[PDB]
Design a protein around this nucleic acid. Sequence first.
RNA 1: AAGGUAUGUAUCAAGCUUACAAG
Lengths: 195, 320, 286, 184, 102, 166
Amino acid sequence: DAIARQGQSKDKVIYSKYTDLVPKEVMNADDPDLQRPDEEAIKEITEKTRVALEKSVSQKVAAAMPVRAADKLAPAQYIRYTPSQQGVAFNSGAKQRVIRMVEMQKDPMEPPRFKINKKIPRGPPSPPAPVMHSPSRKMTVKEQQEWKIPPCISNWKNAKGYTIPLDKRLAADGRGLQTVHINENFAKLAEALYI
Amino acid sequence: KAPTMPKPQWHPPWKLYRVISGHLGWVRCIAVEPGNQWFVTGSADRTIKIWDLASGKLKLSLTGHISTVRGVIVSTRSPYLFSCGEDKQVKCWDLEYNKVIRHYHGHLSAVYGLDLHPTIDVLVTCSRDSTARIWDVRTKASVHTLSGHTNAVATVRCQAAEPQIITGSHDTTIRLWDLVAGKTRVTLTNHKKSVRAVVLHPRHYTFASGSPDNIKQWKFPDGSFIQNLSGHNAIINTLTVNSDGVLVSGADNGTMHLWDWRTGYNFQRVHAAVQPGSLDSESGIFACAFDQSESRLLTAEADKTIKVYREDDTATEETH
Amino acid sequence: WEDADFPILCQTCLGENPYIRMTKEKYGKECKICARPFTVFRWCPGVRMRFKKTEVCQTCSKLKNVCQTCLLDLEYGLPIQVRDAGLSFKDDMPKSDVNKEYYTQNMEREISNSDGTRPVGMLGKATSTSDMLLKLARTTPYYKRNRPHICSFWVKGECKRGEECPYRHEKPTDPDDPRYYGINDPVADKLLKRASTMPRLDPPEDKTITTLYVGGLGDTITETDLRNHFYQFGEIRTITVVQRQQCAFIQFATRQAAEVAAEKSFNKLIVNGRRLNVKWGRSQAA
Amino acid sequence: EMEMKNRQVNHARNIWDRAITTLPRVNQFWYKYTYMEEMLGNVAGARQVFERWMEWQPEEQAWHSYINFELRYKEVDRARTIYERFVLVHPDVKNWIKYARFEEKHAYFAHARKVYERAVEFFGDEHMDEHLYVAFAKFEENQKEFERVRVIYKYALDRISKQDAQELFKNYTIFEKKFGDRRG
Amino acid sequence: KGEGDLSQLSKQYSSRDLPSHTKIKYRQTTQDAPEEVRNRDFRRELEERERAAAREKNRRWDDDVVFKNCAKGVDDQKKDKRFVNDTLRSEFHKKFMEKYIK
Amino acid sequence: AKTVTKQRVESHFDLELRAAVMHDILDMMPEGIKQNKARTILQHLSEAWRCWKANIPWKVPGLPTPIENMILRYVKAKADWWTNTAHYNRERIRRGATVDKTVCKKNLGRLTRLYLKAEQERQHNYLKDGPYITAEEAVAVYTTTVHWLESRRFSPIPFPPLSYKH
RNA sequence: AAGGUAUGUAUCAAGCUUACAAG
Ligand SMILES: [Zn+2]
Ligand SMILES: [Zn+2]
Ligand SMILES: [Zn+2]
């Protein structure tokens, strides 16, 4: 599992083994696992999802369109932190060192400060889940020969190869055919005028 | 003598009883009202049009797409339908005025499928570039871009219970998303050829996916390979499922196969004709949707035609 | 691109007050390495001291376990290449603008989103420590870091401010000895300072001092501890554990292995939690 | 093959295992990784690679390659172990007659007769697939007249419309004639 | 933690992103609001609707001329409303390509 | 991203059509090792469209029947789009909604194609469907003209001599 | 207003940028 999963937070990569592409046995009416959750469970996951994307879109429009007159904050909230690195005679008695953190005012006469113009290429994606198809077949050397394509014998190409062999010049039936080439009633007209 | 040979339930066969011949362009996606009165379609005629579901007449043809219309759906909670097509545009056709009111924007390529969350008012859309997006209706603001695929994302459905969003893509994989965090929960690598249709059931769990190899069938928490279905071996486009377990798979060569949900028993195997102008090799199904009654199965095909099917009231076409 | 909640900040940069008041921006300056907009914080360490805002982002501090403004080690109070040579591994990072630079910072941020607790690769070799670095880890730090830098107009004698010039005066700096890995000017002098300590003189003979007066055994060292610390050196010729003075006598056959014991134990061999007692033995038939 | 072309063996193995867990169904990765460990020691690592390769249920080409591996290290025990799990998945007649192999290498007397029992009771109970009892007659004719009269002539309820084609029944007769006690 | 340009990284308050239609119409009670869908029959109602809509559609002047009668107008009658979709042969393209070109 | 305004309508239809036929042949061909020599089905598609506009038959020999009939359904799709835009903004430049010169000079070309291919369809259906005039229906006209001309005593025109006066 | 008097390279300052981390 740790080879297929590498680093991920115990996701559902467990498909890496064979035993879960075989068809699961036949279910008939087994309501506890087969049926959906009830209306109360789907309503509570509705409410969790709705308030999550609601605070997401509220912070979004209070950042995408935040232009209108909000208060700053009330940053009186202190923060106590035990400096758990050095303290023996560093600031002799600095056992827990509580600090006051305020938030600096932003003047509303400033342009954007930082050049948001950077482009790096897209990073490494999620490392690949295993693939687990059916056993891949190969057809023949004859039906694979059936699934091949002739080259292009165009009249304008402006592409890879204009491709002149000796044959493949007419490139049609005869470039024209009319299946009898004449209806015979012409005769039954023509001599009818001639006489 | 086969495993699960005796126990499929007998479903009656379906037959045509009208075709509807109106578009000038491939009719491409069908939706139908929550209130059963009329249904709606897009095209490559760049014109949505709605039709009386009873008499088949044309109520109105409303237009505004610069290019073809790959998807159209009509909302249940709100009185307006949504549309999406290859003009990169996703629109909110208000129905009380027959005009566009929201006109969503941000997809970097063509737009293939769209679906409405059935409980809260968001909208999940899938494109050609690689991504799917969570549009917030009322703000027309992209909540998430679901960036995890490597090719075109052919279809998307979404539901109320977890997992929320299911994107089947043209890089042969399904994946199942978190609507909240945006990250994918679980990707489903099967299907040597690409998945182009998923559908959910809507009584119990267990959705099902569609692909040229081996239409499969899954199970919602974690994803679990329940079953694969039989050899409907065209490059299939649509899956639709009725509340009494019948399931129609519509494909690109005209053939559409009826099934059942329970066993997997291929039932009817119906292949329809083309209407006079079309050549023989132009039959293919792009949409299929049941009625709210689920007495009518109506398919939008490449022959610029909506074909409307119904049941058959006999008994002696019995199961083998 | 980056928000924060509280900075990293080694102890000499906080100042001598346990009660300090500190202010924050939301996207302050940029990082002085990767140009990333962190949240700059500012405070007053002490009443005679400059403000010393915040220099690099939280990401570029979590990479090398470095404090936030003076760019020293968070575990020791030492420069960067002192730590990386003293741990013999560099944990590479590019130099150019994009060439793998913001790419690797972006991706190492993406794989640091889970913990937020420890550095990304130093965690495995920050345990096997405290031998070669602990001899130079200057506790009770000097606060001359925090003093305000030297003003002009006292350099030119012009400073009309008189006493209330906040910066400094009468500290002319010298233009002979003043980035992130290498090379840094005082660090070469400090590694020369550690390579050139004050030992005992090496007496003029041919390696006869295979015996040594090591003692201070007390109740900590036992016989098998010291002879298995010397068995990795090599073979004895005669051990004793003389407990009237709490001492131990070991030698080597052909001195060389015990030679590094003389290098290991110039008041320096620290096992069992004690500064051991070491002076020179006889090797003189006395 | 770049990492294996050089002396970095640990890294080549350390990417072969992620290649075969990422892409199971492609045969070449399993083949080259087994082959690499064959060129190294034949450690239970190599057998573990092989049994992982068995676990995905491959075709014949791989399975009797693994029994060929067990034969080229001369395993009575282990080629017995890994070849009963074979036959459940491939019931090929070419493989039914080659589960009849402990005869033609070890002669396995009573339990080889049990292998013939296992051959005779399974599929084609009245239809035989026209081939099992040819090779069973070849071994039991290579054996004495213990119970060789039964299967071609007197267990003959299980015919295929003539019990055999014309190609072999006179050959059945002269097959039974001249390899016995030959009583006057 | 540092999203794309729409979130915080840009002040480009573009038009078309301006708070238009900022409240949602819900489908009220006289339409097909989902409370009036949670019980409705849909099958008998559709059936009676189509059973109601199906029954809605319920001499001595020119005897020297040569062609004394063509005897037929179109040779049966002219009412088709047929639909060829091969677009060069459709009757819309026939009437287009006889109205404009001449 | 950028919308599809009126100057890149035609340069977006080709883009999405060949994306659709690309990941239709990508999901239609079976497990052979090469797909299309990396591009060749698309070359057959564009050649099929050029032969459609020029009314040349495009009978390429030796092509697999799924790809040849998917090329037929895609070029019928594009021909529907092309002629249904030709009808539309021909009527617009008839009543005068637009004055666009690109549109006028383009819809003269997108309609000369249509006339000339309808005309070779009707010249081709003159030959296989016989003369549209009957034998009696033409002998009647001929007899009527010789009666008219001999009642007029119309002396027929001689071929002009080389020494003709006027 | 654009749609025409091309753009693409190689050396040479002010414009703008922090006035910082520092034995
Ligand atoms: Zn930084
Ligand atoms: Zn510091
Ligand atoms: Zn001064």
